Design a protein around this ligand. Sequence first.
Ligand SMILES: *[C@@H]1O[C@H](CO)[C@@H](O[C@@H]2O[C@H](CO)[C@@H](O)[C@H](O)[C@H]2NC(C)=O)[C@H](O)[C@H]1NC(C)=O
Ligand SMILES: *[C@@H]1O[C@H](CO)[C@@H](O[C@@H]2O[C@H](CO)[C@@H](O)[C@H](O)[C@H]2NC(C)=O)[C@H](O)[C@H]1NC(C)=O
Ligand SMILES: *[C@@H]1O[C@H](CO)[C@@H](O[C@@H]2O[C@H](CO)[C@@H](O)[C@H](O)[C@H]2NC(C)=O)[C@H](O)[C@H]1NC(C)=O
Ligand SMILES: *[C@@H]1O[C@H](CO)[C@@H](O[C@@H]2O[C@H](CO)[C@@H](O)[C@H](O)[C@H]2NC(C)=O)[C@H](O)[C@H]1NC(C)=O
Ligand SMILES: *[C@@H]1O[C@H](CO)[C@@H](O)[C@H](O)[C@H]1NC(C)=O
Ligand SMILES: *[C@@H]1O[C@H](CO)[C@@H](O)[C@H](O)[C@H]1NC(C)=O
Ligand SMILES: *[C@@H]1O[C@H](CO)[C@@H](O)[C@H](O)[C@H]1NC(C)=O
Ligand SMILES: *[C@@H]1O[C@H](CO)[C@@H](O)[C@H](O)[C@H]1NC(C)=O
Ligand SMILES: *[C@@H]1O[C@H](CO)[C@@H](O)[C@H](O)[C@H]1NC(C)=O
Ligand SMILES: *[C@@H]1O[C@H](CO)[C@@H](O)[C@H](O)[C@H]1NC(C)=O
Lengths: 459, 459
Amino acid sequence: YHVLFDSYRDNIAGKSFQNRLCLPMPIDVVYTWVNGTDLELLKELQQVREQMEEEQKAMREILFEDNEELRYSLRSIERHAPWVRNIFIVTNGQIPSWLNLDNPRVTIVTHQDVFRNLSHLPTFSSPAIESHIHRIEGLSQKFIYLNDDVMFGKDVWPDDFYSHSKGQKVYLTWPVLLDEEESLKTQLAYFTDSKNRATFADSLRYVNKILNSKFGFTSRKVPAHMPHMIDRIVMQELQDMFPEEFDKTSFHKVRHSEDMQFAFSYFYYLMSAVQPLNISQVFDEVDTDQSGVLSDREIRTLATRIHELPLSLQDLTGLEHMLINCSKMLESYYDPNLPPVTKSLVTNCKPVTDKIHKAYKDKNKYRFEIMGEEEIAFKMIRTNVSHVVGQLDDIRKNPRKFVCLNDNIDHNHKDAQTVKAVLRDFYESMFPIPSQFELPREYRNRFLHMHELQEWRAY
Amino acid sequence: YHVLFDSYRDNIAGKSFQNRLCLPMPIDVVYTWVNGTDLELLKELQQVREQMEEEQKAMREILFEDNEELRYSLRSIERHAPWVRNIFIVTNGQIPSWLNLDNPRVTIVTHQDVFRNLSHLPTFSSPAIESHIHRIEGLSQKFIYLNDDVMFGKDVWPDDFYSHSKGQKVYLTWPVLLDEEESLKTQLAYFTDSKNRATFADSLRYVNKILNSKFGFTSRKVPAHMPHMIDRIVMQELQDMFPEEFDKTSFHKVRHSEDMQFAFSYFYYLMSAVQPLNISQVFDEVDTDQSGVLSDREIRTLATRIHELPLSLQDLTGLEHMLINCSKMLESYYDPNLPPVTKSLVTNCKPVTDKIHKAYKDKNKYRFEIMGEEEIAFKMIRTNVSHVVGQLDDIRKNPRKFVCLNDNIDHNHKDAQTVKAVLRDFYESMFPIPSQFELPREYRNRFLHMHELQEWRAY
Ligand SMILES: *[C@@H]1O[C@H](CO)[C@@H](O[C@@H]2O[C@H](CO)[C@@H](O)[C@H](O)[C@H]2NC(C)=O)[C@H](O)[C@H]1NC(C)=O
Ligand SMILES: *[C@@H]1O[C@H](CO)[C@@H](O[C@@H]2O[C@H](CO)[C@@H](O)[C@H](O)[C@H]2NC(C)=O)[C@H](O)[C@H]1NC(C)=O
Ligand SMILES: *[C@@H]1O[C@H](CO)[C@@H](O[C@@H]2O[C@H](CO)[C@@H](O)[C@H](O)[C@H]2NC(C)=O)[C@H](O)[C@H]1NC(C)=O
Ligand SMILES: *[C@@H]1O[C@H](CO)[C@@H](O[C@@H]2O[C@H](CO)[C@@H](O)[C@H](O)[C@H]2NC(C)=O)[C@H](O)[C@H]1NC(C)=O
Ligand SMILES: *[C@@H]1O[C@H](CO)[C@@H](O)[C@H](O)[C@H]1NC(C)=O
Ligand SMILES: *[C@@H]1O[C@H](CO)[C@@H](O)[C@H](O)[C@H]1NC(C)=O
Ligand SMILES: *[C@@H]1O[C@H](CO)[C@@H](O)[C@H](O)[C@H]1NC(C)=O
Ligand SMILES: *[C@@H]1O[C@H](CO)[C@@H](O)[C@H](O)[C@H]1NC(C)=O
Ligand SMILES: *[C@@H]1O[C@H](CO)[C@@H](O)[C@H](O)[C@H]1NC(C)=O
Ligand SMILES: *[C@@H]1O[C@H](CO)[C@@H](O)[C@H](O)[C@H]1NC(C)=O
């Protein structure tokens, strides 16, 4: 209504402060989903053949099952984060079977639009897709990146990702010829478990080395595995910031030890971005009259803010002498011979600008906030029924706003189906209600409810 | 426009989240101003006579200058905090000479409306007025209290006073017959310097004793002297919380060692307010289906959240036995004899509620946040020109969002007019532009500009 619109201009100034009080909206969600269809594995095996023959030429020259985390993640988005405008899922050519494509708020974005060099679409590597979300048509300036296996809880709000006062919120964790032989080593670890999508520590070390070479030496931690808020403008600045470095990440059809991630690279560039000093900004903020001419009080506050306290009169006299020097080379003051101090006089006197730069050291271009792992759930699910049930009960007793469960099950064990059933039971317990993004389905499905009962009986 | 209104319902849920994303508005400002007119001092002296004669009967039975802080504070409100809707000034009967009463956004509220028992209006004591701001007609639910001597800076925003996630922001500082003889002592310290308005540590100790008696023993700090955000609902709850205790503060016509303040009392009640446990809330949050009946997963999460991890099967079996006990006294489960678990069954089984209370201990009714003195300026201005100029230069070099300058000048010294001139110079330097609340005035005033120059020459 018009009353609501006019209520925001009812302050003393009479202006509007929507951009400072009502948080940055809209905010979108981006998912990276993949499926283990027969065509995907066939492309995988031919790519293995190509890489093997490439290595063969190199030393000749020298001479599966997914327990539906996307469904429950979308349910979590609907339940705890109902302020999301649009949800995007990036896939090669696969469309989720149970997603309701008729819903305008969910869209499948193929790799054709995501990638710009159409010769890299059969990439089959998560960092390559991670490097190019911000180029999606219709994406908001600020969006959250979801890794298809992280869920929400405790009614998460955008206040937990970005704040207008302290900037973005950064969550950190534990601190971080012959090349053909190294490439020969990389062909052994291709099938570890990570082609299930969405070799890691080495890449982190490479990014640390690059940032160290450009931003200087600093002890760096790694971001937590949790839904990350990404700014399109900042990410694009990072893209042009290392043009050829991002090419290598997109060029590789295998996640290589030499590439840069989505969170470590984006966040630490945000924390280390240096903005050049603006002399005009200094003059404007010091000049409270906005008249362009400084009085004795403005000169005094300049001297205090340039020099170091305590301020002796010699500092102010020297600053005045420096100011009168420049005028000869190029509302009454105490010193009769001191000319009017305008922006041009202070921005053209080289030693004065040098002292200003000495006082105004390099600031940070973007604000940021740092927090620990008191609100992030990262649990390890490895083939042990007792450990899994204990961890899930720990989740249940104390909910956290960011929940991650790595599904690297052995898949060849007597206690794999039971663990899968327990995980499905936990996911359905957290979020039973079907989401709006799900096609009408799951009729008379009756997933195994006795395996959970079986481990209850065993324990 | 209608597009702006409809944009807030463009999320997945389709609802509106104005009350959670756009901060609590409107927010008002309340000033406590007083002037040293001849009538005020005449009432002061007759009150001194009454108190002296009261003490005389007691042991018979046994047998000035203000340097315009309100102007610059209003200028600071306009410059750095332009989001304030209304500004209120509470005075006995005095109206500031230079205030523009034609401005609808500034209003003078007399003590008649502030006080409810019309027999206490000649109170002449700051805590008495402090106890009754929240009863002002037209005041917002959340407002900032200004002590007529605290200014703003660095473009303060409501984010620095209250946050929707962490609640209100609390700023703390350094940790905290025969009665007729004590009353005889109190008559000596009546004129110290504090009848200039807007005996202090003893009152803090009294409030600490009251809170200790009611909220238990806890090490308590004192709030900083800075513009405090006060909630009308919380303050009213505190008013009814100690009905007769607040009477003594309002009854006294002298700020007595036995009374309770505006910040220490309000804040620590906010930090210690205990809300009784709601069993219905527990049942609702545990029941994710909202169907009113709990399944095996809901029972399991109840057991995990009531008992202590690790959860043995004996705990769950005991909880189930307890549940089936109550039904006899008053979607298939694993135990065939376990009746459907509704809200009534769990809220009527006494031992289950006892265990829930044991797990769900007493929570805090209101959220709060704690910060230090890294953004509050409290400087001491005592008759020393060098100390004053050093402190003011320290203010200038590093601005802070909350600036306080106590004007307890000796007023009988060779260096009092110089200090007053330096203070006026600093205030005009920070905020030269006249505010909208000032009547057109200050023509050809030409306040002394040579005393600052005089101390420049001396130094
Ligand atoms: C993921 O891939 C599976 C195959 O790996 C696909 O599921 C097939 O769906 C078709 C229907 O078009 C059935 O005829 C096949 O029997 C299914 N295969 C299997 C192994 O069940 C589908 O592309 C994706 N399925 C899901 C659930 O995401
Ligand atoms: C699965 O995890 C459980 C813990 O939940 C393991 O139980 C531990 O067993 C060792 C020795 O067998 C004991 O010293 C520990 O005290 C047990 N843990 C607890 C919490 O009591 C169990 O061994 C794990 N199973 C496998 C196959 O590793
Ligand atoms: C504060 O009190 C002073 C007196 O203590 C008042 O100023 C007087 O204003 C009248 C005009 O109505 C003059 O005729 C008097 O000469 C003033 N007195 C003095 C001592 O200057 C007034 O009530 C208040 N003044 C201010 C500036 O707030
Ligand atoms: C006013 O404050 C200044 C400090 O700004 C005092 O100067 C100090 O004087 C003592 C001895 O006289 C020295 O030991 C200190 O080093 C001085 N301070 C500084 C910062 O150098 C001055 O004494 C004060 N004046 C009065 C009357 O107390
Ligand atoms: C990227 O595209 C350019 C032409 O636009 C092409 O020359 C280059 O080889 C491509 N990169 C590849 C194929 O890795
Ligand atoms: C920063 O500098 C640019 C040009 O150097 C100027 O246009 C801009 O107004 C400055 N920003 C300020 C004064 O805030
Ligand atoms: C520049 O200023 C200094 C004082 O800081 C003065 O001694 C010197 O003579 C000035 N330069 C010229 C060319 O006058
Ligand atoms: C407050 O008002 C009541 C009546 O409303 C009166 O009895 C009482 O004496 C008053 N308190 C005083 C005068 O301190
Ligand atoms: C708290 O309890 C009251 C009654 O005891 C109930 O009306 C209210 O809905 C409860 N709050 C919840 C369930 O959030
Ligand atoms: C209550 O439950 C306990 C098991 O915890 C059981 O031993 C007892 O018999 C029950 N009470 C009655 C009256 O049956």
